[PDB]
């Protein structure tokens, strides 16, 4: 029939139907819907403003650009995380505040299906929404899937520490996309009364941040963090952020007389000029030559006084905030291959010794945040075993993963629980067939592996076994049920214990079964070690 | 006496008194009155905004700049259409939103004289208001004459097809200046309740557009289109305008990743950079090599969705719309010398044959928009007459004139007529003594020839025979009478029948008398041909 | 016990304590508090906009930058006027709208002490607030002292003479600071209901202008003009100013097609570019050859139609406005050494004859504004006496001093008196030990010599004698009493008569006592000569 045409507040939107195998009702897809005014010129380094309305019918049938980022790194991550057959090459632009919608609802009628907003990851430096296709999830579980984008790197996170540039522009874009949904999603057969935000990695941490922010209050009703939370140090800048702002400005060829002078100067810079600055800063690579405490991994989240009134530690410590069902999960080997490879980690010999371990762990300061006085003990706790240099390197990775995702995730889960809100945890342990060739088959539950089950990659790509297909059908149902009742459980699916005092979590993989006290031991150790 | 000082909404304006040979009543003249804020910087490619108010008295005693255009092309047209003796040298600037006023009213007393607002032509690419002196008309028929300006070329008509740059900036200016008139004319002895708009060529097509625009309603009560209407295709863009925008962005050295990207980039360019882009484009000149269907004649009117909700063809269909007295006229030989000479036509030998005719007609695509399979029938219907190559060249010029003005003008008139509103038509056939020395004396009723009678050139220049002086007097009468009563008739003047079903019109010239069915046979042929 | 933290409408401010010998209660100092939004980008050449509120605690413990100016000239004047022991070197920046506060109040309690707002001088081309340390005056007279800054030169006074750039930006900033004081001063223990503005030189003229401006109505309750008033021609521009605008524009490398075009262009220029333009104009210096009337001193105050509705002459002619106690004073030798030296006067021979003098006075047209036909007359009235060139040189200095400050000051005073408001006058006659070596010891009461006494330099620098100390205590007490009651009289002080019909004034110096009719003779004379 005639392409799908939905009416929104700003104007009519045109899309295209896409039927999936085994589903009569085709899925309506809208690509590149603007949810905010293009942040160009004077709007750079400022909160997102509403999108100007249009006079006729807007054709939303073309993938939007991805926010300015390292094009090589961007395309690489996309190819590794995409759930669709062939990766979709994208263009770069500052005009990237768009979102993609996938509704399996029959627009001719009135439907109120649950809405699931996806926040992509990429360390807040790279990524896009187009990378994730929701055609499968939307059909198999009959939910309206929405993928959003937000300013990355300098454009979405540059902060001078004061009012001239508070920061968190990227986080504000997410909040704006959430309001867009509350105001228009009903036009796509989605129930604005039931919105679930979920994201992986930096997207995960973003979810945690939104769950603690007063600005997002009432913009969602359930949240899910996949391998990433607000306690994930590397993504949250604590202390005086001024030194960073100046370092960036100097590189860009700007004076540092005052804050307003820097912001003004940086606004004058071109996109290419700021992309070059980015490349020079080398944000997603382990800095070897230099002091570990001087390596700037990124311009993560900050305490601007708007989105976040104080550090995540401080905020969660209190129990006076709108609580919602929150699902926090991690993978078996978060630091298995993906992250180390991208960051170009030194580990290439396949083995390591205490001395070298403590040497590498040190330079990993901008990631784990371990005082040089805690290096020995930390290394001993994980490598103080077998003489096998090879088995050491493996325990070294588990060492890093526990500090970045493991312990943090569990902590957030505990606090949310104590806050008196429905909490859930899981430990994904599986090795997708879509993995990379360079990835050693001895790795399972790597960073981002759960993505393929979540977005039903086995229903779009080819070569998926019946075992890999069912696993996905299970995850999608678990997720979708949560978006529906704030409870993953359902008929035909194993039992998922709510993370309470017993601290029971679900283990997903070849064999999905419940368990208890995830990393419980690991947490204890670090909680004391970190206490100096 | 002392310089006239009128009080307007945004401040007091100072002018000067000028006396015309024989008239005791001195005419108050104001030059350079702003009717909007200068469309500089971010205000480029945006609607005109109200002008900021001034403190003391503003000297409105100097000619304003003409809108940025091809300085050479603009200077030529100014010297070929000016009715004043010596041609005034103008300056270029994006700061060109001014209007000139000519009032014979006695400012010392309340006066409600009819107001005639003039809209200059020039293919929407060149032109200016200072070119036309309103002294003679204002004094002879006692009416306030107002010449207005509007953004041209890229500045006034650049459109990306969407909300990022809808377009028709130039027409919105025409509207702004009209609202200004309704708000201030009374202070100049003019009656806002009786404003007549009239223009020639592009100024004519503009009147035709305002007559059809829901925004213009109530800003004028009488319309006059001299050689140019909404059906003159060359000036109206249909279909996706996105290609033209992208071609312009590229020529200016801008990326085309998205609409917003283009507009932002172009807004960062200097006036001169856009003027160089203009010259590079080579607009008003016939392209003889390439593809006629791709040739870009100019940047005209589009369907923004604010000024025009749909194409003129569809608009004139409806009856449910406000209607006013409309006078549509054309010249004997619209494609006689002027236009061809300006666009550099291959016509130099002074004759033409059937074979070279069909070829030329095709390259003339951007003007007559005639299919390539229709060329044979069209050429045979006009040139199949005699075997005289010279007559074939003249009958070929009649071909282009009919398609660009003849047929369009009549169709527009018949629609206004059947719409239930007073309509009037005429055909000017005379050769002013103010013609160029380069125009053959055999050309009678060439494009723009009426302008000399309309603006009483015979009373400002020299060499005008009494016969020509007489023609001018009659013309200004009819006009002013039409302005006064929406009817040209008045004792002392030949009778001008209303354009009703008998399709009676007036032939102006040495011998002025009525006739019937103007271009009747012509309209039939062209409507039937295009039907295929 | 802990750094001073104060809450304001815009956010928290953090200062520092500084104790002054003789006072138990340490003074709370706040440096660099923003009272407006940085006048950058499109904000240049526009009214000051409110400052953006900050989220946490802002540290105002660092000296703010001074507005862009001649770095050399700026730093020189600061060392010559500074009352602190060591001159503080400052940075330049368009982001200069800050104010400094010195409060002797105990912020742990509720206090409401009189507020004295200082407006530094420097011909509206240079100067800073930081130059003046309020520590002494604040502690000694128990009053809150506020030092403000305002846009200088082109940035603060560029006028096209119309609505596209009225001018007086620098005066608007001063008014913007006064509003900030009324909204937040109570947080600093200040009494918003008792604000006294005072300034020296261009600061004196500013105060004088604020007294005639409707915009300053109810923003201060007492005024003090030290050596400068609104009748000091040199700082006030009369007549068409457009010619000056164009002159700057061309120098800066801009077009001059229209006013809007000129302002649009200058806004594009970088700080460094406008600064280089400043240095080129040679604003401070004096041209010895050419034509005196073709020179150009500066960009003083203009008649914008906002800040000032008409010339100070016309405005003071009316007794229709808010009348507040006004104190106007001058020094013994206004043109004794300081100004001449800074402009580089050819008086490097210490001698001057009746013929060489008539030449200088003419060349000094932009400073005295005297028709060349009058030069001979005036020159006689002063130098027509002794045949001693050495005395002629001195009498010549008295000539200029009387025309710039002497006569203007008394006239301004008398008019205020006749308006029926409290008036007072004084004449400082002392030679501060904190003078410059290169300064002749025969010069007593040079321009700005009262500043050392007013700001208590004897209590900040070293070597002051018991006499110089006593003088400073007396002056401060006099100023503080005036701020308190609008009357300088108090116990322990001589009697300062009001400026009624007897025209009594105070002779401040080593021997302070009252007198009558200040410059009465000179006032009568000049008024006559100028009557031509
Ligand atoms: C690259 C591209 O095709 N641009 C298209 C854009 C984009 O879809 C939107 O900017 C969101 O991507 O808008 C249209 O689709 C539309 O509204 O009619 C037309 C145009 O073809
Ligand atoms: C370039 C130039 O000379 N500017 C002139 C302008 C123009 O009138 C307006 O810009 C409209 O052109 O304003 C004046 O006339 C005026 O109001 O006193 C002064 C001046 O003569
Ligand atoms: C570069 C500079 O000196 N500016 C400084 C400003 C100024 O103190 C205020 O803006 C008043 O001028 O704020 C800081 O001191 C601060 O709040 O800690 C840090 C910053 O470095
Ligand atoms: C892309 N990798 C390169 C070539 C193949 C693959 C394994 C090898 O890595 C190592 O020896 C590391 O020690 C390592 C890294 C990541 C996971 C396991 C082991 C280096
Ligand atoms: C300067 N002109 C050149 C040589 C003489 C004169 C007429 C001719 O004109 C044309 O071919 C035109 O196409 C034309 C103009 C006007 C009337 C008829 C035909 C070409
Ligand atoms: C260096 N100066 C020389 C010798 C001592 C001192 C004073 C004198 O000049 C004057 O008295 C002039 O009045 C003057 C001219 C220029 C600058 C400052 C003072 C000339
Ligand atoms: C390409 C490099 C991609 C960066 C994404 C991996 C880092 C994840 C994280 O820091 O949370
Ligand atoms: C069929 C109706 C015919 C009128 C259209 C004529 C084309 C106009 C033009 O080429 O400018
Ligand atoms: C160094 C330049 C400083 C100029 C300051 C002197 C005051 C000038 C004046 O009052 O006209
Ligand atoms: C928009 O889509 C419609 C229907 O698919 C099509 O007719 C039109 O050409 C498209 N417009 C664009 C973006 O070219
Ligand atoms: C504020 O000042 C304190 C010291 O007084 C300093 O430690 C801190 O860095 C400043 N705040 C910031 C982050 O600007
Ligand atoms: C405009 O004319 C008036 C009338 O004397 C004059 O005051 C003003 O300066 C003139 N403008 C210019 C810049 O020529
Ligand atoms: F991430
Ligand atoms: F035209
Ligand atoms: F000064």
Closest listed ligand to the CA of C283: 9
Kindly write down the DSSP assignment for every residue of C2-21, as one continuous string. ---EEEETTEEEE-EEE--T
CB C231 within 8 A of CB C408: yes
Q: What whole-number distance in Å separates Cα of residue B164 and Cα of residue B258?
A: 10
The answer to whether residue C450 is catalytic is no
The answer to whether residue A377 is catalytic is no
Within 13 Å of residue C179, how many CA atoms lie on the same side as its CB?
Answer: 15
Inter-chain residue contact C95 with A163, CB threshold 8 Å: no
Six token digits for residue B478? 């009819």
Tell whether C89 lies on the interface with A, counting CB pairs under 8 A: no
**Nearest protein Cα to ligand 3, atom 4:** A258
Six token digits for residue B451? 């302008």
Q: What is the count of residue pairs from B and C with beta carbons less than 8 Å apart?
A: 36
Give the DSSP letter of residue C383.
Answer: H
Q: What whole-number distance in Å separates Cα of residue B344 and Cα of residue B341?
A: 5
| From A201, A225, A364, A435, the catalytic residue | A201
CB A413 within 8 A of CB A499: yes
Six token digits for residue C375? 């030069």
Buried-exposed string B149-180: b where 16+ CB fall within 10 A, e elsewhere:
bbbbbbbbbbbbbbbbbbbbbbbbbbbbbbbb
Tell whether A238 lies on the interface with C, counting CB pairs under 8 A: no
Cα A447 from chain centre: 11
Q: What whole-number distance in Å separates Cα of residue B223 and Cα of residue B220?
A: 8
Task: For B154, list phi and psi in degrees, rounded to 5.
Answer: -55, -45
With a Cβ cut-off of 6 Å, ligand 6 is lined by C 337, 340-341, 345, 347-348, 350, 397, 440
Six token digits for residue C23? 């006072």
The answer to whether residue C164 is catalytic is no
Q: Which helix (H) or strand (E) holds B5?
A: strand B5-8
Q: What whole-number distance in Å separates Cα of residue C444 and Cα of residue B219?
A: 73
Inter-chain residue contact A261 with C93, CB threshold 8 Å: yes
Tell whether B163 lies on the interface with A, counting CB pairs under 8 A: yes
Give the DSSP letter of residue A39.
Answer: -
Closest listed ligand to the CA of C15: 11
DSSP strands (E only) in C349-495 = 423-429
Tell whether A41 lies on the interface with B, counting CB pairs under 8 A: yes
Q: Which value in Å is the resolution of this experimental model? A: 2.8
Q: Report how far apart, in Å, the C-alpha atoms of A93 and of each of A98, C16, C206 are.
A: 11, 47, 49
- B59 in contact with ligand 2, CB cutoff 6 A: yes
Residue A143 CA to ligand 4 center (angstroms) comes to 39
Instruction: Of B408, B412, B410, B432, give the one whose Cα is nearest residue B515.
Output: B410
CB B427 within 8 A of CB B502: no
Residue B115, strand partner residues: B144, B195
To the nearest whole Å, the CA of A222 is away from the closest chain C CA by 29
Mutate to test the interface with A, among B165, B167, B168, B258 (most CBs of A within 10 A): B258
Task: For C530, list phi and psi in degrees, rounded to 5.
Answer: -70, -20
Within 13 Å of residue A271, how many CA atoms lie on the same side as its CB?
Answer: 20
**The pairing of beta strand B513-516 with beta strand B504-509:** antiparallel
Closest-approach residue (CA) in chain C for A268: C41
With a Cβ cut-off of 6 Å, ligand 11 is lined by A 161, 240; C 59
Structure determination method: X-ray
Task: For B194, list phi and psi in degrees, rounded to 5.
Answer: -145, 80
Residue B113, strand partner residues: B190
Six token digits for residue C288? 């010895």
Cα A118 from chain centre: 9
Q: Report how far apart, in Å, the C-alpha atoms of B376 and of each of B29, B373, B381, B402, C168 are.
A: 54, 7, 9, 17, 72
Inter-chain residue contact A42 with C41, CB threshold 8 Å: yes
Cα C230 from chain centre: 11
CB C230 within 8 A of CB C186: no
CB B100 within 8 A of CB B30: yes
Closest listed ligand to the CA of B392: 5
Task: For B14, list phi and psi in degrees, rounded to 5.
Answer: -110, 135
Kindly write down the DSSP assignment for every residue of B27-50, as one continuous string. EEEEEEEE-S----GGGTTS---P
Give the DSSP letter of residue C406.
Answer: I
- C234 in contact with ligand 9, CB cutoff 6 A: yes
CA A261-A266-A271 angle, 5° bins: 170
**The pairing of beta strand A57-59 with beta strand C11-14:** unpaired
Q: What whole-number distance in Å separates Cα of residue A115 and Cα of residue C110?
A: 55
Q: What whole-number distance in Å separates Cα of residue B334 and Cα of residue B204?
A: 13
DSSP SS3 for C361:
helix
Q: What whole-number distance in Å separates Cα of residue A209 and Cα of residue A154?
A: 19
DSSP SS3 for A293:
helix
Tell whether C304 lies on the interface with B, counting CB pairs under 8 A: yes
Number of H helices, E strands in chain C: 18, 14
**Nearest protein Cα to ligand 2, atom 9:** B32
* Binding-face residues of B in 255-284 toward C, CB within 8 A: none
Instruction: Of B322, B132, A259, give the one whose Cα is nearest residue C93.
Output: A259
Burial label, C349 (beta-carbon count in 10 A; 0-12, 13-18, 19+): exposed
Q: What whole-number distance in Å separates Cα of residue C289 and Cα of residue C335?
A: 22
| Alpha-carbon Rg for chain A in angstroms | 22
Residue A145, strand partner residues: A102, A116
Inter-chain residue contact C56 with A306, CB threshold 8 Å: no
Domains of chain A, first to last: 1-532 (3.40.50.1820)
Going edge to edge, which strands form the sheet with B98-103?
Answer: B16-18, B27-34, B98-103, B144-148, B113-119, B190-200, B222-226, B326-331, B423-429, B504-509, B513-516
């Amino acid at each position: 029939s005639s392409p799908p045409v939905v009416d929104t507040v700003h104007g009519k939107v045109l899309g295209k139907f896409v039927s999936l195998e085994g589903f009569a009702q085709p899925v309506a897809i809208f690509l590149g819907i603007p949810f905010a005014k293009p942040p160009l010129g004077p709007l750079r380094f400022t909160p997102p403003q509403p999108a100007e309305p249009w006079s006729f019918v807007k054709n939303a049938t073309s993938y939007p650009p991805m926010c300015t980022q390292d094009p090589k790194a961007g395309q690489l991550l996309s190819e590794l995380f995409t759930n669709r057959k062939e990766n979709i090459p994208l263009k770069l632009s500052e005009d990237c505040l768009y979102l993609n919608i996938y509704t399996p609802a029959d627009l001719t009628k009135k439907n109120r299906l649950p809405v699931m907003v996806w926040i992509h990851g990429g360390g807040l430096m790279v990524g896009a929404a187009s990378t994730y296709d929701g055609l499968a999830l939307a059909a198999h579980e009959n939910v309206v899937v929405v993928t959003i984008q937000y300013r990355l790197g300098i454009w979405g996170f540059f902060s001078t520490g004061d009012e001239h540039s508070r920061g968190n522009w990227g986080h504000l874009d997410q909040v704006a996309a959430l309001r867009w949904v509350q105001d228009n999603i009903a036009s796509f057969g989605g129930n604005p009364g039931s919105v679930t935000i979920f994201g992986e990695s930096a997207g995960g941490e973003s979810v945690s941040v939104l769950v603690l922010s007063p600005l997002a209050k009432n913009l969602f009703h359930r949240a899910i963090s996949e391998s990433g939370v607000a306690l994930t140090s590397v993504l949250v800048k604590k202390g005086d952020v001024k030194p960073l702002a100046e370092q960036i400005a100097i590189t860009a060829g700007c004076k540092t007389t005052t804050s307003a002078v820097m912001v003004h100067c940086l606004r004058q810079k071109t996109e290419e000029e700021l992309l070059e600055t980015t490349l020079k800063m080398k944000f997603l690579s382990l800095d070897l030559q230099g002091d570990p405490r001087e390596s700037q991994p990124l311009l993560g989240t900050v305490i601007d006084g708007m989105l976040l009134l104080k550090t995540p530690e401080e905020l969660q410590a209190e129990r006076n905030f709108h609580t919602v069902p929150y699902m926090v999960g991690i993978n078996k080997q978060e630091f298995g291959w993906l992250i180390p490879m991208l960051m170009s980690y030194p580990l290439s010999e396949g083995q390591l010794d205490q001395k070298t371990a403590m040497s590498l762990l040190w330079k990993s300061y901008p990631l784990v945040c371990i005082a040089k006085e805690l290096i020995p003990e930390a290394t001993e706790k994980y490598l103080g075993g077998t003489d096998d240099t090879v088995k050491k390197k493996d325990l070294f990775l588990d060492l890093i993963a526990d500090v970045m995702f493991g312990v943090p995730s569990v902590i957030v889960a505990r606090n949310h629980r104590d806050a008196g809100a429905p909490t859930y945890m899981y430990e994904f342990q599986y090795r997708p067939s879509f993995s990379s060739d360079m990835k050693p088959k001895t790795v399972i539950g790597d960073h981002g592996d759960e993505l393929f089950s979540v977005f039903g990659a086995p229903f779009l790509k080819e070569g998926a076994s019946e075992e890999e297909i069912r696993l996905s059908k299970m995850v999608m149902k678990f997720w979708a049920n949560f978006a529906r009742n704030g409870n993953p459980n359902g008929e035909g699916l194993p039992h998922w214990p709510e993370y309470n005092q017993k601290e029971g979590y679900l283990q997903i993989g070849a064999n999905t079964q419940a368990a208890q006290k995830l990393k419980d031991k690991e947490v204890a150790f670090w909680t004391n070690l970190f206490a100096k």
